[PDB]
Design a binder for this molecule. Structure first.
Ligand SMILES: [Ca+2]
Length: 223
């Protein structure tokens, strides 16, 4: 997260860290046994880390659970990142408490102007590299599609939405991928991609979760 703030230990209880020997992506707990993340975050042998704040210090509220099954969206396109969403089932149910809670799926899509909360342990520099050990937060509004499309050299589909700032300085970044974008108490997006980080004329692009609720519910009910 670039231009954000320190969230506060466990203030984003649904936020998870995907670990394969180190943190590589974020995710969201949607129920005691399932996590939603980005398909481009797929990796073999994933361990999900819950109740985390500082990812390099055992603080006392963590739960480390290995994935039993990973399900990348059937139509994921690695060249355009269309349908960049993936489901991960945990080997055992997470223990839900005040520091580990699930986030609700949307009943309808959110509109431009709506403020959302984006979080992650990604790079905090638009230029250079600096990875935080504690969770960073950023409040950002959903923008009209044209806001991202105007200066984009890549395809932006109806399965993606634009969020962030046009004058740069604030944005999600590498390492934040797969993380949540929560608006009005609902998981509306997944950190997917962008052109650099916090660059002018180029806000972030996120997977539009509201388009995948049916697939998510059917898959969870059948696995
Ligand atoms: Ca920790």
């Amino acid at each position: 997260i670039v231009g954000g703030y320190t969230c506060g230990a466990n203030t984003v209880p649904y936020q998870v860290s995907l670990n394969s020997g180190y943190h590589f992506c974020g995710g969201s707990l949607i129920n005691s046994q399932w996590v939603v993340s980005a398909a481009h975050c797929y990796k073999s042998g994933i361990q999900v880390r819950l109740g985390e704040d500082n990812i390099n210090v055992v603080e006392g509220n963590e739960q480390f659970i290995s994935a039993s099954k990973s399900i990348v969206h059937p139509s994921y396109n690695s060249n355009t990142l269309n349908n960049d969403i993936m489901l991960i089932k945990l080997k055992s149910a997470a223990s839900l408490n005040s520091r580990v809670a699930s986030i609700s799926l949307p009943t309808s899509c959110a509109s431009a102007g709506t403020q959302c909360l984006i979080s992650g342990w990604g790079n905090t520099k638009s230029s250079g590299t600096s990875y935080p050990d504690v969770l960073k937060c950023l409040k950002a509004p959903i923008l009209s599609d044209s806001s991202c499309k105007s200066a984009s050299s890549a395809i932006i589909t109806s399965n993606m939405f634009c969020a962030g700032y046009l004058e740069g300085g604030k944005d999600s970044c590498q390492g934040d991928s797969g993380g949540p974008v929560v608006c009005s108490g609902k998981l509306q997006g997944i950190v997917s991609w962008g052109s650099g980080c916090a660059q002018k004329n180029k806000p972030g692009v996120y997977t539009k979760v509201c388009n995948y609720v049916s697939w998510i519910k059917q898959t969870i009910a059948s696995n």
